[PDB]
């Protein structure tokens, strides 16, 4: 079909335009709740770990797809391999609270601890990217204009301190995995495949035996 390309109104043609037939599609696997709901390993800190979803590497399935949203919501599960007992403290806690056992503490039971945690941030939703500051006592943020170069001022910014699901602490934490529960994603952002050197990106794919 011809259309006005400048418009931005989505145009979806079908193989019927030249005598084919559109088939049925079952899209259960590209549903945000389902695909986000699997564990992903993170490299832990020896002892204090603040629970921050932006810790999962950007190349992973969950890191890739979490960064393709601007704002998101979820509850959380973690599974942790640790020495001693594991204490978790909600968003907003003083870090010295990590040492008090009335705060949710799980006693060591081999091989690991898996916990269901609530969303505790003070915000209706959290963001993978945030164009601003949370420290007050500063000078105002500039209203930047210019080309892409102008965006290099922002690289030393850390995401607001309120963007976390609390923190956990144990004597040694050896392994940490996150799993997003009931996930919601808003405002898509770029998702990048590997860029090939060749005409086609080629990989050894799993094939029979000999």
């Amino acid at each position: 079909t011809t259309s006005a390309g400048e418009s931005a109104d989505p145009v979806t043609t079908t193989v019927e335009n030249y005598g084919g037939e559109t088939q049925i599609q079952r899209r259960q696997h590209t549903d945000v709740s389902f695909i986000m709901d699997r564990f992903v390993k993170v490299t832990p800190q020896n002892q204090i770990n603040i629970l921050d979803l932006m810790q999962v590497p950007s190349h992973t399935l969950v890191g890739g797809l979490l960064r393709a949203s601007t704002y998101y919501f979820s509850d959380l599960e973690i599974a942790v391999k640790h020495e001693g007992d594991l204490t978790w403290v909600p968003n907003g806690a003083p870090e010295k609270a990590l040492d008090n056992t009335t705060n949710p503490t799980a006693y060591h039971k081999a091989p690991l601890t898996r916990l269901a945690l609530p969303y505790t941030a003070p915000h209706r939703v959290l963001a993978t990217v945030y164009n601003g500051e949370c420290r007050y006592s500063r000078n105002a943020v500039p209203n930047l204009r210019g080309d892409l170069q102008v965006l290099a001022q922002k690289v030393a910014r850390t995401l607001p301190t309120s963007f976390n699901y609390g923190a956990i602490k144990a004597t040694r934490v050896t392994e940490l995995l996150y799993r997003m529960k009931r996930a919601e994603t808003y405002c898509p952002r770029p998702l990048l495949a590997i860029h090939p050197t060749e005409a086609r990106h080629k990989q050894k794919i799993v094939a029979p035996v000999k």
Partner: protein, 110 residues
């Protein structure tokens, strides 16, 4: 107000929200949400400090001045007085009708 009967005064309480410096004068403070009252039969005046923030909750603990932990200032001014020199105004605080505390934490402390 705790002064004698021949001691008169007029006061102002203003809530100064974050993002600029808190007012130093009743006149600058006039542009905030504020209340003014004077002394008479009734010794007590009560004022609700409003919850105004970007987020829906804010922190009870403080760290370093940020969005989530400082919520501006409360400013108590004296407009004038008539012979109230030395008299005490005593102030108390209580939770409002929609005051809400959430997320228990034990953090050493008392």
């Amino acid at each position: 107000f705790t002064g004698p009967t021949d001691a008169k005064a007029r006061y102002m309480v203003a809530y100064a929200p974050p993002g600029m410096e808190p007012p130093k004068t009743p006149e600058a403070a006039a542009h905030c949400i504020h209340a003014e009252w004077d002394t008479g039969l009734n010794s007590k005046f009560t004022f609700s400090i409003p919850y105004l923030s970007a987020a829906d909750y804010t922190y009870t603990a403080s760290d370093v001045a940020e969005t989530t932990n400082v919520q501006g200032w409360v400013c108590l001014f004296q407009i004038t007085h008539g012979k109230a020199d030395g008299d005490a105004l005593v102030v108390l605080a209580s939770a409002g009708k929609d005051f809400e505390l959430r997320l228990p934490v034990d953090a050493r402390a008392e």
